[PDB]
């Protein structure tokens, strides 16, 4: 939704918080970096949050196909992204996306309809 503003910040921020690691931020970077994730939007196409598990999926999927092209350049800077993002989530001040993201884990017995044990139960 309107939260889209988050991306605008993430792009400028993440890139900034990156330069600190010794990285560079060029316009050509937005075209590729933006088009890269946008491809499969691994950041959760629903909430658009950060995901470590999914991140690996896109990482191996891109690295695998990219490798087939026997690339010599193989930019290592990508290593910094994983390291930064890895700890980036640790932040609790993450946009509300936290509540919409938590969707990752849900009570298997939230309702009676659930096959598992009902939400309400009694025991001696």
Swiss-Prot record:
Changing residue 56 to F: Redirects assembly from host cytoplasm to plasma membrane. Loss of interaction with host DYNLT1. It comes from the Viruses. The record marks 99-100 as: Cleavage. It is found in: Virion. A lipid is attached at residue 1 (N-myristoyl glycine). Matrix protein. This is Matrix protein p10. It comes from Mason-Pfizer monkey virus. The gene is gag. The chain holds residues 2 to 118 of 657 of the full protein.
């Amino acid at each position: 939704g309107q939260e889209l503003s988050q991306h605008e910040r993430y792009v400028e921020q993440l890139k900034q918080a990156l330069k600190t690691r010794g990285v560079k931020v060029k316009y050509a970077d937005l075209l590729k970096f933006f088009d890269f994730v946008k491809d499969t939007c691994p950041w959760f196409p629903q909430e658009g949050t950060i995901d470590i598990k999914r991140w690996r999926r896109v990482g191996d999927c891109f690295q695998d196909y990219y490798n087939t092209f026997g690339p010599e350049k193989v930019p290592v800077t990508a290593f910094s992204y994983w390291n930064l993002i890895k700890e980036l989530i640790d932040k609790k001040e993450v946009n509300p996306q936290v509540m919409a993201a938590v969707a990752q884990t849900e009570e298997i017995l939230k309702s009676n309809s659930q096959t598992d044990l009902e939400h309400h139960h009694h025991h001696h």
